[PDB]
Amino acid sequence: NSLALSLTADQMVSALLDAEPPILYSEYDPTRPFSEASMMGLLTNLADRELVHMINWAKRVPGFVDLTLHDQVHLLECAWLEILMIGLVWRSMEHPGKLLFAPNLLLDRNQGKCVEGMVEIFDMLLATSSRFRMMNLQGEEFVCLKSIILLNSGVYTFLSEEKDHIHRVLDKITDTLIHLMAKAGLTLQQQHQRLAQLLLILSHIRHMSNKGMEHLYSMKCKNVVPLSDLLLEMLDAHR
Amino acid sequence: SLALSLTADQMVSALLDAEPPILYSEYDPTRPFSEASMMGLLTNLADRELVHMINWAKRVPGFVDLTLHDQVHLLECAWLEILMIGLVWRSMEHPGKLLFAPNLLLDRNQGKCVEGMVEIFDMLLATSSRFRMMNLQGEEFVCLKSIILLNSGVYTFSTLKSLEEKDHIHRVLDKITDTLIHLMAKAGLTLQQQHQRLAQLLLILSHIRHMSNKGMEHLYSMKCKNVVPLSDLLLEMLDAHR
Amino acid sequence: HKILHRLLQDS
Amino acid sequence: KHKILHRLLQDS
Ligand SMILES: Oc1ccc(-c2ccsc2-c2ccc(O)cc2F)c(F)c1
Ligand SMILES: Oc1ccc(-c2ccsc2-c2ccc(O)cc2F)c(F)c1
């Protein structure tokens, strides 16, 4: 039996909030004109450090610890870029037209031009951020959506009881989301409508990850920007 | 607009009545199939399905109210997703097999006839297996398929008039959500079960997008590899994603 | 212009 | 197989 299923909705919210990773900083070199190699270096360095904190946060997601090691590996291998992106989108909400990669690394779509094929991913990220802004996405909802991505993105790729537990945890997070919306005063119809709107954005986040993964793969055999072994192994699992 | 004035039952009826037919393949069981013939059978089938899909989309409530350019954009981004959820749906009663056509029923071993096609086959079989475990209903399938058409390109579009076009799409999307909830309450589910099944159904669209992304890349690698000729319409849809 | 464009507007 | 991710999850 899993302890995560015994949690109430409030206890689930507080566990997810308490597990939030910290906001990291980028290099403080203020050389303003970015080159392709310099910008991708900053983002690669930042992303590799965020990955380490993502693993600590995953182990703190209710139900994640009750899975085997290989299932945890599979779920994170499949979702790591999605999870990075929804975090980037979230902390970019209060900065319309910009992406807050770090408090000291705030970029617009013009700066995406420094890297080939990056402006398309920026525009999608900016579009998701604006969509989160227009819905007044709340932090309690954000931590639910991010956990859903972790458990859901890889659960259909368990090829050859464990998946039954993940879906039971996913149902818990759903109950937690509805509980958050009823607590915010939304009617029954507004509740399921908002539930649907939030979950449909995950399909777009998945789309963005797939485009981002191809962009990272092409940078690998460009060999211009060196990639950490951890990123190479996360990247390698998508082929 | 008529889409916002439809009841839940009227929404389901309009969607069911618009269903496209199940098309046959030119599959010759005597013939041996190489890579180039299977992908020719699949490409031929997909190209004829695209024609029905286009005329199916016109009968989706709210789709006609969009501008012609918006209709093009939505179908261009969602077409493979719609083909795949349709294929997954009609394959529910055939575990371990994908029913591309009533006469073309393939397993993963035959999927190995094309390089890299195996991974996409397994993901489709898993999705069909998930629909079977969930006992997905025809009324829910047509809802999800219309959600894909309206949702997959909405983020990828500016003015006060173009905002009212995205606003209308989200109004239709909410109408379909009300329709799904109407279906689940009619089946005897409680409020907790209704929201749980709604989440379970919409989270599958994430995996369908993933399959479409992967399948799109495999079609691109085919167009260069140059061995299997694509139809003119399929090449225009393929160029829309790049 | 596009094939999809023509079929969509085709009546 | 050897994976850095194996070590990070065990030392979390
Ligand atoms: O915390 C984050 C760091 C980087 C990104 C991001 C966005 C587009 S590519 C990209 C990226 C990811 C991994 C990486 O190694 C390099 C990158 F540019 C993000 F979405 C979140
Ligand atoms: O009605 C359908 C026909 C083909 C597919 C399918 C599945 C994997 S590739 C693939 C495909 C699509 C277009 C095409 O031209 C060739 C293909 F192999 C489908 F999902 C639905």
Structure explained in plain terms:
The complex is a heterotetramer, with two copies of chain A and two copies of chain C. Chain A has 239 residues and is mostly helical. Chain A has one domain (1-239): Orthogonal Bundle (Retinoid X Receptor). Chain A is 63% helix and 3% strand. In chain A, strands 1-2 form a two-stranded antiparallel sheet. In chain A, a hairpin with a 2-residue loop joins β1 (99-102) and β2 (105-107). With 11 residues, chain C is an all-alpha fold. Chain C has one helix spanning 3-9. The chains are: A mainly alpha (239), C mainly alpha (11). Chains in contact: A-B, A-D, B-C. The A-B interface holds A 124, 127-128, 131, 148, 152-153, 156-157, 159, 167, 170-171, 174-175, 177-178, 188-189, 191-193, 195-197, 199-204, 206-207, 210-211, 214 and B 122-123, 126-127, 130, 147, 151-152, 155-156, 170, 173-174, 177-178, 180-181, 191-192, 194-196, 198-200, 202-210, 213-214, 217. Chain C: A motif (LXXLL motif 2) lies at residues 4-8. Chain C: It comes from Homo sapiens (Human). Chain C: Belongs to the SRC/p160 nuclear receptor coactivator family. Chain C: It is found in: Nucleus. Chain C: This is Nuclear receptor coactivator 2.
SSE blueprint:
The complex is a heterotetramer, with 2 copies of chain A and 2 copies of chain C.
Chain A: H1 9-18, H2 36-59, H3 69-91, E1 99-102, E2 105-107, H4 119-134, H5 139-152, H6 162-183, H7 188-220, H8 229-236
Antiparallel strand pairs in A: 1-2
Chain C: H1 3-9
Subcellular location (chain C): Nucleus
Family (chain C): Belongs to the SRC/p160 nuclear receptor coactivator family.
Motif (LXXLL motif 2) (chain C): 4-8
